[PDB]
Amino acid sequence: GYSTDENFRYLISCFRARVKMYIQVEPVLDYLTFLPAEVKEQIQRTVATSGNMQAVELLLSTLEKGVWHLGWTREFVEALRRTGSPLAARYMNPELTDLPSPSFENAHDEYLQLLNLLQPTLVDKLLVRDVLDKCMEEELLTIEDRNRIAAAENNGNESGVRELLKRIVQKENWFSAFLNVLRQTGNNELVQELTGS
Amino acid sequence: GYSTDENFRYLISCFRARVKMYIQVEPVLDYLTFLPAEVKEQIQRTVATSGNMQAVELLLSTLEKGVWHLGWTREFVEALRRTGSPLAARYMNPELTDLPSPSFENAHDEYLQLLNLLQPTLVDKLLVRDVLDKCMEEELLTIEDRNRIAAAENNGNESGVRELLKRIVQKENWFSAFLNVLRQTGNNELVQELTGS
Amino acid sequence: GYSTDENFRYLISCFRARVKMYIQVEPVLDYLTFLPAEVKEQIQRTVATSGNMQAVELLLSTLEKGVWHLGWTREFVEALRRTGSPLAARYMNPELTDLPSPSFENAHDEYLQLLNLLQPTLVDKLLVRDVLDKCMEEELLTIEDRNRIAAAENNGNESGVRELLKRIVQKENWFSAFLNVLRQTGNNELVQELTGS
Amino acid sequence: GYSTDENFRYLISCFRARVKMYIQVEPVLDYLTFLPAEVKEQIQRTVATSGNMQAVELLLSTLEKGVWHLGWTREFVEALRRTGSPLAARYMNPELTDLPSPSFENAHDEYLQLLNLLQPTLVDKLLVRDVLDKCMEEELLTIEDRNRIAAAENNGNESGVRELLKRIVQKENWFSAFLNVLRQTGNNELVQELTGS
Amino acid sequence: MQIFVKTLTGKTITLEVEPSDTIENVKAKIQDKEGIPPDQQRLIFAGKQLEDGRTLSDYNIQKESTLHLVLR
Amino acid sequence: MQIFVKTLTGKTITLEVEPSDTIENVKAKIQDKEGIPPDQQRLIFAGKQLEDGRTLSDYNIQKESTLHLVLRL
Amino acid sequence: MQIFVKTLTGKTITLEVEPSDTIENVKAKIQDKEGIPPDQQRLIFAGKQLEDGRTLSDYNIQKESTLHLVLR
Amino acid sequence: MQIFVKTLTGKTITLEVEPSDTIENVKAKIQDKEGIPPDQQRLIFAGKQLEDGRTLSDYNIQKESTLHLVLRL
Amino acid sequence: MQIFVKTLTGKTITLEVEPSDTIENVKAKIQDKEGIPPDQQRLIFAGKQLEDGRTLSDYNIQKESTLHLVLR
Amino acid sequence: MQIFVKTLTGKTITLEVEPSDTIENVKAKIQDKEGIPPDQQRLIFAGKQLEDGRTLSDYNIQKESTLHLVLRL
Amino acid sequence: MQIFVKTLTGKTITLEVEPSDTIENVKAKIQDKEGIPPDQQRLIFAGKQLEDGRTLSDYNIQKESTLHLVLRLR
Amino acid sequence: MQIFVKTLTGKTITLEVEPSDTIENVKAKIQDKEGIPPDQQRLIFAGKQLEDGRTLSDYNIQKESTLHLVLR
């Protein structure tokens, strides 16, 4: 099969788990104009009720089944590239040019597991109000994602940091970028803790 | 020349595609006193899990099938009239007098599609903290709707704009008023990017 | 002078419609140990899929059909009693010495059916921010319900009220107690609306 | 054994009720590539309609019949292995030395019935807002689970706990890890309750 | 006008009555055909206690509708 | 103008009114049609206890609308 | 090219039209076989009012598309 | 009075007590008929621990009510 | 009390046993009936493995119950 | 570089262009085939207005893409 | 071992490989059995991209496991 | 005493370790059992490193307590 629509369908099957963890589905719903106004509403409710990942699945499932205007697979991908989930944009491209090197994917895949084990220290010793502004210019947070972190920061610092960490790990080259924040931030102790050195 | 229930079942069969967009089903349920509480519970779920638009389809469908007590139609229409969804009330009104002119329906379909397209532009450039009060003052948002939007933008300005754009697109003559709101407030840039002049 | 199981299977057949208004099925499932966790989850889904009242209808049904370990009937009653829905216990206890007098039942079906009529008036004028605190004091809301209401108001006040007015109607002697909440709280005008004197 | 299929088709026959508790079918459907996309929808709805466990029943049923691609079993197991629920990966493995010692299986069925008996105590006292963070430090919640814990916490804390306890009982050696979470947070009452020290 | 009165034993009870009678009368007709004293009788329709003062039509008792009886 | 009055128990009352009628007139028809005294009527329409001195056209009760009747203390 | 102008009375009416034809043409076809003068009927398709000017091609009226007809 | 005690394995054993017995009685008579240490016993009823000090009636157990017997860990 | 042990091969092993019987005796008669060493043997009942010490009563295994035998 | 432009009525048009082309040419290309003057033309791609002074390369259009066409006075 | 790779078209390629073989080795086996050059192949093992330098044992690829093959097409 | 280890591969390995064993003991025995070299690792417990020269007694490593080890 040499059709792009059918190729994109098969490429999801290979990567379906990775993309679900890499897609922020609330923003990407704006640029998906071809999606019916109904399905675009159901997906935003699936975010609220059954978690983001079961929303991205609904987003994906309704993308493949059902025809769309030719050239949508680039509209979808370009949406993901500019709604603060560029790493899923790497995987999603049918021509497969911009797929992160397997050294990168594996190395970050264990970097992500590393943060999960370090959240209790992070949520304690890291404070969002003094890292968000720096995090913006490193270009691993969008205006869309900055507001939520500032919004979640309302009910305590801890809930803010849990939101920041949930958000950076989808950005491209995020671990190296995240460290560049921490060392350029007053949390020079954490970067010792993250990599051990 | 038929009984009001018969052609009302017809009107919710013809205009079902329209009023599925114009009915805000969450507050219209407080007035449907003929609905058994076991149905209003189910619809208040489909609102919560499957999005507002799929709930209206359920609400209308459960209104077609099943006989309700004589005099229900005037209650349903008066429900739409004062829950702040007047445009749906024009279609449902079996007297069939305030039904909007087709050019109005044609245009405001075009403006809606234009609003879906430009939504990523709007969401990134529109602050609901500065536009709700005028929308209340311009009678295209209800106290119901302002509370919903003002509480759905606690998790970020952008997420509130999503809710604001879903509400106003149900109001009567919403576009001209909406532009008037943007023009009346300081948000003059959008209308230049929204009406193309 | 009869078996205790068949006495209870009779009550959930007699008062099935009566009690399904009073049972909050979501928390009562914690106390039901005879139910296989496979079924306890199906009911938890019917809550999320088709609302509480259509979930109790399933819960009571799956008790009427299906043989459980002996001694379940007392467990269900003590489930209802201490899950905060004691009005449902009276209709279930095969010691029928505790069910309310028929005048009381009618006096509370009208006070409920009147509350439904005046629901739009309440939802507009009620503020759950300053009614939850004293409803807990008047012991017609459980800590489970206050969390639910305070979490169902996060998307607007009016969504909080509609959740409050479903929790109240299940409690015991609620109407007088509810008015006592309204009288002490600043919502004095609602009383004149709600009692008409 | 002789053949990988009949080994596996028979391992789901023996251990069907033992994995039904352990398999979280929502994320594991991602990696089951061999399943026709139309079969996957038939299950993704049974999760929505009749809970997870009655869906795993449907999933394992639809595997025990119907020819599948070569290497499906090892594709199934690798799904369970990397979906974060390795406990069922011991039983489903056509290799036998993985499956746990009968005391270990017994010791956990006790640790499971202990929750189902003390769940009302847990639900009322546990706060998933603060206990969640240390639960992912012990790696007893996956990436997918915490989304559903954090999302189900939208409507009340008690819904968060009722969903947390539904997840952690699927992880290998969870009781000792769960107590470590409870002891190393404020919940020193529950550990007193769970173990009666 | 007719009604079915279900009891615990499952032996459904059938009554040929007229909507004008008070609940006492159906509580008194059970005397004439089963003999359970009326005081012990607690007669339920659709999960709603039937006040002895009111009459059957007041509870929207329609033709050959089902009725539940609870004793002791 | 045709109006339906439904009481709490569930029965309906068939009314004959006209939009210029005051509520007392409607209650007056409630008197001679089924027999509840004027002080014992509370009229709820669209979740609003109707004020007595007003008239139907004030609340915009259209043809074959329904009024809910609740007895008072 | 076939369309079905469903009505209140329920009897579906089948009209041989052409996507080149404008709305008034099928409204003129109402004169042929219905007898409702074109002004007071208001044709509707998929929740979309059909204008006086445009053509059925403009509204995507393909093979076997149904219309609705609201009177007065 | 006539109480069922469900052990974790499910082998429920019927008991007969006095509806206001001290919990030591019901705990003791379990091992009289079942044989698990009079201290290993940890009775759970309605999601609650049963401390030995209180009586059966204060925990509001009726007839045919079931207690859950889980072993001390 | 007869119980049904079903093997990977598919042939079902029916065992005349008693609730008083321990697990090993159940394993013991399998040696007689098929020549399968008890070390290889491990019985499964409803996804629950069978500790050797206990008896059939401990696991609520009643008349016409189904047991599973898995080798290796 | 095949591209498409979508009008709101559901019709679609096909174009052949090059990435450095100005939108002015693209709008003018639409006019030649459908008659709508470039003044009335308004092109939307990726949810934004497409400036006339810039080119497709500036807006990262590829082949087989679909633009949206909206009109105004 | 004996592992499977699924291509886009659907047909699965069965390989006589053993855990001692690195990913460069198996990618050659695909080429010898199917014909895609090694520089064009990107092998996927259940949502995990396989590094060229490592061996199957590093990825816990048990016998009769599966791989997904995606080709950087034009 | 026994403890569990989970490499960033996620895999669960049972280890026999005494609190009389310091980190220098466990650093090699995981290498002996698995093959992650003792100097290219680091131990994650309670979200923290582990000092090589310190004993697990210092760190409150109860029986069955689960570790995690990383690749630096």
Swiss-Prot record, chains A, B, C, D:
It is found in: Cytoplasm; Nucleus; Mitochondrion. Changing S85R: No effect on signaling activity and IFNB induction. Residues 4-94, 107-187 form the CARD domain. Sumoylated. Sumoylation positively regulates its role in type I interferon induction and is enhanced by PIAS2-beta. The modification Phosphoserine is found at S85. Widely expressed, at a low level. Expression is detected at slightly highest levels in placenta, pancreas and spleen and at barely levels in detectable brain, testis and lung. Changing K40A: Loss of ISGylation, loss of oligomerization, strongly reduced signaling activity and IFNB induction, loss of virus replication restriction, no effect on phosphorylation or RNA-binding. Induction: By interferon (IFN) and TNF. There is a cross-link at K20, K40 (Glycyl lysine isopeptide (Lys-Gly) (interchain with G-Cter in ISG15)). It is linked to Type 1 diabetes mellitus 19: A multifactorial disorder of glucose homeostasis that is characterized by susceptibility to ketoacidosis in the absence of insulin therapy. Clinical features are polydipsia, polyphagia and polyuria which result from hyperglycemia-induced osmotic diuresis and secondary thirst. These derangements result in long-term complications that affect the eyes, kidneys, nerves, and blood vessels. IFIH1 is the CADM-140 autoantigen, involved in clinically amyopathic dermatomyositis (CADM). This is a chronic inflammatory disorder that shows typical skin manifestations of dermatomyositis but has no or little evidence of clinical myositis. Anti-CADM-140 antibodies appear to be specific to dermatomyositis, especially CADM. Patients with anti-CADM-140 antibodies frequently develop life-threatening acute progressive interstitial lung disease (ILD). Belongs to the helicase family. RLR subfamily. In HIV-1 infected HeLa-CD4 cells, overexpression of IFIH1 results in a great increase in the level of secreted viral p24 protein. It comes from Homo sapiens.
UniProtKB/Swiss-Prot annotation, chains E, G, I, L:
It is a peripheral membrane protein. Changing S65E: Phosphomimetic mutant that binds and activates PRKN. Coiled coil: none annotated. Changing R72K: No effect on ADP-ribosylation. The record marks R54, R72 as: Interacts with activating enzyme. Exists either covalently attached to another protein, or free (unanchored). When covalently bound, it is conjugated to target proteins via an isopeptide bond either as a monomer (monoubiquitin), a polymer linked via different Lys residues of the ubiquitin (polyubiquitin chains) or a linear polymer linked via the initiator Met of the ubiquitin (linear polyubiquitin chains). This is Ubiquitin. It comes from Homo sapiens. The gene is UBB.
Curated annotation (Swiss-Prot), chain K:
Phosphorylated at Ser-65 by PINK1 during mitophagy. Phosphorylated ubiquitin specifically binds and activates parkin (PRKN), triggering mitophagy. Phosphorylation does not affect E1-mediated E2 charging of ubiquitin but affects discharging of E2 enzymes to form polyubiquitin chains. It also affects deubiquitination by deubiquitinase enzymes such as USP30. Mono-ADP-ribosylated at the C-terminus by PARP9, a component of the PPAR9-DTX3L complex. ADP-ribosylation requires processing by E1 and E2 enzymes and prevents ubiquitin conjugation to substrates such as histones. It is a peripheral membrane protein. Changing K48R: No effect on HLTF-mediated polyubiquitination of PCNA. The record marks R54, R72 as: Interacts with activating enzyme. The modification Phosphoserine is found at S65. Residues 1-74 form the Ubiquitin-like domain. Changing H68G: Loss of DTX3L-mediated polyubiquitination of histone H3 and H4. The modification (Microbial infection) ADP-ribosylthreonine is found at T66. It comes from the Eukaryota. It is found in: Cytoplasm; Nucleus; Mitochondrion outer membrane. The record marks H68 as: Essential for function. There is a cross-link at K6, K11, K27, K29, K33, K48, K63 (Glycyl lysine isopeptide (Lys-Gly) (interchain with G-Cter in ubiquitin)). Exists either covalently attached to another protein, or free (unanchored). When covalently bound, it is conjugated to target proteins via an isopeptide bond either as a monomer (monoubiquitin), a polymer linked via different Lys residues of the ubiquitin (polyubiquitin chains) or a linear polymer linked via the initiator Met of the ubiquitin (linear polyubiquitin chains). This is Ubiquitin.
